[PDB]
From a paper:
The bacterial [name] cooperates with its cofactor [name] in assisting the folding of roughly 10% of newly synthesized proteins, including proteins with α/β topology that fail to fold spontaneously. [name] is a cylindrical complex of around 800 kDa containing two heptameric rings of 57 kDa subunits stacked back to back.
To validate this finding we solved as a reference the structure of stably encapsulated [name], an obligate [name] substrate, in vitro. Encapsulation occurred following the addition of [name] and ATP-[name]. Alignment and classification showed that around 40% of [name]–[name] units contained density for an ordered [name] molecule close to the equatorial region of the chamber. The substructure of the ordered [name] molecules was solved at a resolution of approximately 3.7 Å, showing side-chain density in its hydrophobic core. The encapsulated [name] was native-like, with a root mean squared deviation relative to the crystal structure (PDB 7LOO42) of 1.4 Å for 366 of the 379 Cα atoms. The main difference was in the conformation of residues 97–111, the so-called core loop. This region packs against bound S-adenosylmethionine and an adjacent subunit in the [name] tetramer, but in the encapsulated [name] subunit adopted a more extended conformation that was not well resolved. The core loop apparently remains unstructured until tetramer assembly following release from chaperonin. The encapsulated [name] makes multiple contacts with the [name] cavity wall, contacting two subunits at Phe44 in the equatorial [name] domain as well as five subunits at Phe281 and three at Tyr360, both protruding from the apical [name] domains.
Numbering used by the authors:
A (entry chain 1): 4 to 382
B (entry chain C), C (entry chain B): 2 to 525
D (entry chain E): 2 to 138
The structure:
């Protein structure tokens, strides 16, 4: 079947807002090991707004973090209508919470209860080496390539705003080729249109997509309307958490819709999804299945998870009862237990803000160290 | 998902209905008196076209089996476009005629295999008959006539294409881009040039034209980035000891070397110019090697263990003149050895074959033309964008037709060559009766294009076809003048390759499409 | 998605219905008696407008075929607005009339291609006839009359534009901007001015205007960013002994350097001011070189190989006065050589004719006007926002019409020039009967605008058109006063460029739309 | 969520209908001359099985009360599978017969608890009788 996945670059206002929220979270976590963070960001033309509820014993000024973060993308000029230093950032964050002494008492951290009700999902397939759906993975790699080239200085007239669309066809459930590649990017006005598409296809499209998957039927689309000079926060409204589907899987996996950016690890809306991906990746790397998903359910005010379900699409080499048995006795699905074994309480959420929360080997939740043990047990 | 299965005559009727819908959509644009088709596009204004392939690429139907038939027929036009560039409407008409007659024969109670074998045998004989009928096309008059006929009887574009082809030659590239004026203009480039200009505005010694001209200069080729002058002290001092200028072709030179270069040029010690290396990636090194071969010099690459410090006059090429402006750099009359030129063009020509994308074929053909030959561009002119697209499509069709006619030859146009072939193949026979029936089907359906051409003019196709069959040789019918005469004398020429490809693809698709027994598709 | 295909008369009827809907929406705003059209806007309040292109840009129908017809017609108005900036309703009316008569002829049984050829031939003859009829427009009275006519008969805006064009000169820039008061205001700038102000608020010495006022100062031009004071000592000491002030133009100066400059200005050692270099990129350097040429100085650039410590009093320019505000800086009576200025503007204009983009040219004419001439801003005054928008649109239309009239010339307005041209071509003939029919169609459709104007006035168009056609020369009908007379005497002037563009674009679109046979679009 | 409550004979007849559906599905695979049952699978090909537990694990009814009855009886087959490995169909047949006769007795106007006591006593005696009848193998 024909399926399309779309990815966006770091220069987009929503991605800018997501990067700001995660940058603050890392700064707060570095200063406060056990802080509570629930933040949101809004960006518009020349005005930047931040809000939410963050309860911590330390203080951080948001101005220097925002200027440092925005400068990283490359908004250091007024030509696109947004400059790092000329802009203004205001704070609308309540730094204190009434419940700081009433609930300070704790009985046992190992028996902490879930603060939200809902069910979360994971996903992993052996189609790619990174154990991820191909169309979303290659879409992220394309915009990642554009930023690396832009930062390298070989292509100085490129702009942070960029969007890519990749189309994949499946024959009998396997990848047989690439159909259409679209890369929408903003460029400077000095370079004409004809020279623009030549540089992008030969240095971004060519050395990223596999050569053996490209046939004569592949169609390359660059700048459909013909002029993408207009861009930045001026051309679109900016807010936090609107394309969670793009960040997680691109639509190939059912998702709960919970926002990721700007949330502390304490909330299960973010960390429990990370553990589900970690479990799903581990259970598929051992070769027990071709594809697998983990359905973990939690209830607000309830410690023990209500139900854990595993579905395989009939590709399992062992009965599903064995699959469920292994995850229960080898993975600690406790809301605090998964925190300790995934050691997420470190300032590592800045890089996760852009280019997808999943699909990178260096992430703690993307390790496959437990794959070998499960293969021996199920074998 | 669930599937729906239809057996026999029902599936055949649905398939024929889809084929008829697509063919009736396409057929209205055939001949000199055909009409245009408006294509709806959600992203902007509708596009009006007369191309058969453009109409066929857009048609799909609500019903599943009719959609099957339409999609199966679409490949005839698609392959005719990809192979020859013309004959898409003729191929579609021939395929429809084969399908109709073959379905009638199958409904008469005959097995499809024998009909398909007979059709294949008849087409195999017809290809050789067409090859026998062909005549070479060498003079510019015939090329102009072919270009005129291929562009809806537009003499200006045919004459322009003939003149451009004569100027460029046989080993060259002609391309069409949309212009800005109200009338078409032709621009030809002699020698080689690349879209790279001078780095700094202080190099121009002739401000009247805004371009710098170097007489008998050197050429220095480098692939490494330049930020310090220390690596060019020997070469610059050596060429300043001689006096005649030097040119630097590097991928990029930073401002530190620009400062010393410009101050040396201004102070009147050594006259140098700098241009960036054109292109990017492996193509950049390939064209750098091409420049090295043509200018009689040697490239300097760091990765091959060659350093610029040890370079001398033997590693620098020569040229008669060099003209550099804000956007282009031209090397005039290089002093390279010829056999290297033939070797390089042969290497690129043989590398063309293994390329799978026509974009790479275009790039390597452009490289061959740049290294040897000339390059010409045709800037079509129209007042409105829609007319711009229409004229551009017509000019591209004329270019393809002229190229094919030069490659293989021309035959009498108006659909009379196929009639002559069918009349000469009247004694073909097969193994059994059904093969003979298939041969008769093919021979009878070879007459479709002329009948459709006459029908588009509003006359009676039967009497015109009967009159044409009574003649011999190149006798035919002129649809523009509504009178008979010698097709060659009146200038109605058709390439042999286009007719052969259209016949082959139409027969190949229709023979398989006839044999269908049942269809399997998803439920609505 | 599944498509819908309609053939022949049904498609033509749907297309004509869409064309009629759009043309009826647009044509109610033609002439001096034309009324307004209100366009709904989702964000904000709807806008009262009288422009043909503004109304045409919004129309889109529910039915797919009529929508395609409307989208094809809309390009006439779009192109007419983009090319000349005026005369879009006339183009739409002409296109509708040509389409109607061509569809009638096609339904009568004629060949669409020959009709299109005849239309093109007639329009080609009409263009040269119009070029023959044109007369020059140079005096200020004719420019004022053109501006008055093009602005819905408003004397004040015409007089304002005439006097602004007289004051600025022949090569200048005039723009419109929202005003504050209830009356129009013209602001003309003398000298050179760039949109950049003082860096530090402590240079101000005249709080009466909140600005600095330097009398006969030196101008220091440095391309590089100034971050250390060490390079500043030599030229600062040199200018300290002279006693005259000094101004610094650099890309950016850090506050460490500003501190000592502010201290020196306070203590009265040197009267210095610092402003940023306007622009960014190559244009920044180009117009800073233009500043150096105007002021008679030399740019101290690191790229050329010249250092700031070695600067002397010869490298500093001079001017009569320099005024810097919070946002603007003006150089009054820059001392320089006239021949150098003429050479620079000659170089800039010869770059101008090589500009292939509209956006890349206006900056070039702005630079030309900045070096030689001046710029003007016209402020429109209105109590309410909607009235402000409508008045600004009318003023822009008048400005474009005056520019076109000065560029090419004027002809008698009111739609009588087209009538005279059509009366001159009464003997034009084609190659066959169909081309003659097309020529007659074009000639008869050339009289639509006058009939539409008279119909909008509320009279019988037929008798007025018959009376006008019975005269000769500039005889016409005055729609405002409802009386016949000499068009030039009454001051009803239309530029030749807008009439020619409207006719050409209307014919180019209508002739192509005539030859449609079938239309394919998505299902509802 | 809102609940539905049924009292007495209606609940009992719904339960018996569910039990009868499950038992009729299962018991056609008993003995040397019993036939097979085709079980549909969402991902893959249908499986043909003669097991009692395999058929019982897939029976889920539309009505809620009959579904409750079927789920209650499925425990017999599940426990017989997990305990000895055989005797699933025989256990299901015995459970259905006991349920039917006990429901008839209850509808006759008898105390269900004492019927449960009598059934337990009879089965306790029968286990000892079976132990006495056993022969070494
Ligand atoms: N003046 C003419 N008289 C008779 N036949 C013509 C004349 N001009 C063109 N033809 C024939 O009509 C055909 C035109 O086909 P065309 O509409 O270009 O579709 P395609 O070339 O895509 O198949 C040509 O094959 C040519 O032989
Ligand atoms: N007082 C007048 N008497 C007769 N004709 C006039 C008079 N004023 C304007 N006209 C004509 O009416 C036309 C006005 O067109 P207008 O409504 O401005 O639309 P557009 O300029 O966009 O075509 C002009 O072409 C002009 O020739
Ligand atoms: F319609 Be074909 F491409 F000439
Ligand atoms: F309607 Be036009 F722009 F005067
Ligand atoms: F029915 Be049992 F599994 F033999
Ligand atoms: K055609
Ligand atoms: K108007
Ligand atoms: K059994
Ligand atoms: Mg053709
Ligand atoms: Mg007007």
């Amino acid at each position: 079947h024909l399926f399309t996945s779309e990815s966006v670059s770091e220069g987009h206002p929503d991605k800018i807002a997501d990067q700001i929220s995660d940058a603050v979270l890392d700064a707060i976590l570095e200063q406060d090991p056990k802080a509570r963070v629930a933040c949101e960001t809004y960006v518009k033309t020349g005005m930047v707004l931040v809000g939410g509820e963050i309860t911590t014993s330390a203080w951080v000024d948001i101005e220097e973090i925002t200027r440092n973060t925005v400068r990283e993308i490359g908004y250091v000029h007024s030509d696109m209508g947004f400059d790092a230093n000329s802009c203004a950032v205001l704070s609308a964050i309540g730094k204190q919470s009434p419940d700081i002494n009433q609930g300070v008492d704790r009985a046992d951290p190992l028996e902490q209860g879930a603060g939200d009700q809902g069910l979360m999902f994971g996903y992993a397939t052996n189609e790619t080496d990174v154990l991820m759906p191909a169309p979303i993975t290659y879409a992220h790699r394309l915009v990642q390539r554009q930023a690396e080239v832009r930062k390298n200085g070989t292509l100085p007239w490129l702009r942070p705003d960029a969007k890519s669309q990749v189309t994949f066809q499946y024959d009998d459930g396997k990848i047989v080729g690439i159909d259409a590649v679209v890369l929408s990017t903003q460029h400077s006005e000095e370079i004409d249109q004809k020279s623009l598409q030549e540089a992008v296809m030969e240095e971004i499209i060519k050395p990223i997509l596999p050569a053996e998957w490209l046939t004569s039927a592949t169609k390359f689309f660059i700048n459909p309307t013909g002029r993408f000079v207009i861009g930045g926060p001026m051309g679109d409204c900016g807010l936090t958490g609107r394309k969670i589907i793009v960040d997680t899987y691109g639509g190939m996996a059912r998702h709960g819709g919970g926002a990721f950016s700007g949330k502390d690890p304490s909330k299960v809306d973010r960390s429990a999804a990370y553990a589900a991906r970690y479990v799903a990746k581990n259970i598929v790397a051992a070769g027990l299945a071709d594809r697998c998903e983990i359905q973990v359910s939690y209830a607000i005010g309830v410690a023990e998870p209500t139900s854990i379900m595993v579905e395989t699409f009939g590709t399992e080499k062992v009965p599903s009862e064995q699959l469920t048995l292994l995850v229960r006795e080898f993975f600690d699905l406790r809301p605090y237990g998964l925190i300790q074994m995934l050691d997420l309480l470190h300032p590592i959420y800045k890089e996760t803000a852009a280019y997808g929360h999943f699909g990178r080997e260096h992430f703690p939740w993307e390790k496959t160290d437990k794959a070998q043990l499960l293969r021996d047990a199920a074998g | 998902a669930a599937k729906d299965v239809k057996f026999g005559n029902d599936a055949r009727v649905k398939m024929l209905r889809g084929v008829n819908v697509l063919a009736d959509a396409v057929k209205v644009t055939l001949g000199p008196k055909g009409r245009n088709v408006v294509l709806d596009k959600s992203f902007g204004a509708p596009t009006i076209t007369k191309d058969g392939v453009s109409v066929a690429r857009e048609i799909e139907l609500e019903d599943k089996f009719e959609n099957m038939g339409a999609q199966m027929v679409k490949e005839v036009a698609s392959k005719a476009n990809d192979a020859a560039g013309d004959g898409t409407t003729t191929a579609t008409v021939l395929a429809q005629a084969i399908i109709t007659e073959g379905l009638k024969a199958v409904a008469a109670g005959m097995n499809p295999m024998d009909l398909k074998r007979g059709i294949d045998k008849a087409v195999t004989a017809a290809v050789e008959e067409l090859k026998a009928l062909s005549v070479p096309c060498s003079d510019s008059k015939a090329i102009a006539q072919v270009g005129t006929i291929s562009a809806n009887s537009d003499e200006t574009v045919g004459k322009l294409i003939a003149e451009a082809m004569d100027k460029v030659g046989k080993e060259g590239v002609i391309t069409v881009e949309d212009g800005t004026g109200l009338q078409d203009e032709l621009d030809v480039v002699e020698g080689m040039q690349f879209d790279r200009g001078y780095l700094s505005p202080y190099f121009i010694n002739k401000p009247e034209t805004g371009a710098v001209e170097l007489e008998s200069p050197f050429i220095l080729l480098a692939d490494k980035k330049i930020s310090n002058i220390r690596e060019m002290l020997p070469v610059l001092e050596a060429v300043a000891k001689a006096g005649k200028p030097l040119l630097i072709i590097a991928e990029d030179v930073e401002g530190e070397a620009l400062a010393t270069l410009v101050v040396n040029t201004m102070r009147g010690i050594v006259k140098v110019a700098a241009v960036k290396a054109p292109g990017f990636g492996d193509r950049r090194k390939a064209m750098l090697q091409d420049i090295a071969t043509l200018t009689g010099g040697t490239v300097i690459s760091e990765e091959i263990g060659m350093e610029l410090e040890k370079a001398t006059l033997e590693d620098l090429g020569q040229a008669k003149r060099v003209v550099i402006n804000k956007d282009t750099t031209t090397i005039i009359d290089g002093v390279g050895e010829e056999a290297a030129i033939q070797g390089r063009v042969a290497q690129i020509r043989q590398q063309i074959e293994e390329a799978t994308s026509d974009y790479d074929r275009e790039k390597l053909q452009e490289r061959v033309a740049k290294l040897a030959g000339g390059v010409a561009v045709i800037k079509v002119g129209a007042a409105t964008e829609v007319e711009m697209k229409e004229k551009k499509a017509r000019v591209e069709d004329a270019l393809h037709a002229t190229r094919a006619a030069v490659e293989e030859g021309v035959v009498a146009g108006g659909g009379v060559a196929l009639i002559r072939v069918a009349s000469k193949l009247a004694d073909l026979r097969g193994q059994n009766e059904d093969q003979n029936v298939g041969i008769k089907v093919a021979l009878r359906a070879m007459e479709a294009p002329l009948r459709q051409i006459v029908l588009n003019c509003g006359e009676e196709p039967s009497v015109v076809a009967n009159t044409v069959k009574g003649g011999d040789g190149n006798y035919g019918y002129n649809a523009a003048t509504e009178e008979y005469g010698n097709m060659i004398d009146m200038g109605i020429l058709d390439p042999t390759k286009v007719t052969r490809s259209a016949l082959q693809y139409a027969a190949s698709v229709a023979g398989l499409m006839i044999t269908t027994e049942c269809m399997v598709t998803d439920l609505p």
